[PDB]
């Protein structure tokens, strides 16, 4: 197994009301998990749990290797889309294409003249939304890691454009990897091989698409 929650429960308070109330999942390694749930269900605080960044009170986590997180609040730093997206890694040519494509970027890109050089975050070119949120999403992707946390990635985009990311990147191109995907939408759900319904901090669902579809 690559991931395990078992009966977690996590406080970001002391004295205060739980965030997480006993949950329990299981990823296989390549697996993918979809976190879904409203608002302030506590989606977030379960990856930074994964991260070390929030311990818990009762129940155990199992987690190995090097972490890539997504926020889902995109981000973008000064220097070119490039360095952007690299960020701090070591270069492959084709390990980058196949980022940008994944993310639809090789469009955006291909009508700057400066081209992969464009330079973002120094008061330029103004990015849309949705161009900042796959920037920020190739970030996270092209990093190697263990573990994939995808915080609601697909910020700003219309459905079709993220049905086809999540198809190309998030099933096509990161088939081999462990993901967590929080994201609500049931193509997503029924895709994943698990599936995790939070609800102020509980689990409303934990399962399959297909196991809710026969209840
Ligand atoms: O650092 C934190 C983070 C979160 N919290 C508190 O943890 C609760 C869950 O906060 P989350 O940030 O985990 O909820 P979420 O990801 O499911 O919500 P969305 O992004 O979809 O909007 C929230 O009630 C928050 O106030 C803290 O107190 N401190
Ligand atoms: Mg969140």
């Not at 960020?87 to 400066?114: P, T």
């Amino acid at each position: 197994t690559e991931v395990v929650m078992e009966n977690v429960t996590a406080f970001w308070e002391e004295g205060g009301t739980p965030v997480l109330k006993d949950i329990n999942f299981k990823i296989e390694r390549g697996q993918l998990l979809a976190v879904a749930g409203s608002t302030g269900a506590g989606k977030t605080s379960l990856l930074m749990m994964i991260m070390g960044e929030l311990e818990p009170s009762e129940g155990k986590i199992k987690h190995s290797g090097r972490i890539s997180f997504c926020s889902q609040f995109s981000w973008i730093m000064p220097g070119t889309i490039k360095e952007n997206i690299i960020f701090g890694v070591s270069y492959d040519e084709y390990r980058y294409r196949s980022v940008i494509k994944a993310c639809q970027l090789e469009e955006d890109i291909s009508k700057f003249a400066e081209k992969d050089n464009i330079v973002l975050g120094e008061g330029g070119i103004t990015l849309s939304g949705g161009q900042r949120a796959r920037i920020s999403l190739a970030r996270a992707v092209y990093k190697d890691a263990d573990l994939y946390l995808l915080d609601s990635p697909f910020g700003y985009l219309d459905v079709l454009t993220e049905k086809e990311i999540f198809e190309s990147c998030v099933c096509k191109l990161m088939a081999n990897k462990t993901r967590i995907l929080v994201t609500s939408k049931m193509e997503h759900l029924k895709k994943a091989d698990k599936i995790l319904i939070l609800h102020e901090g509980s689990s409303y669902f934990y399962g399959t698409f297909s196991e809710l579809q026969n209840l």
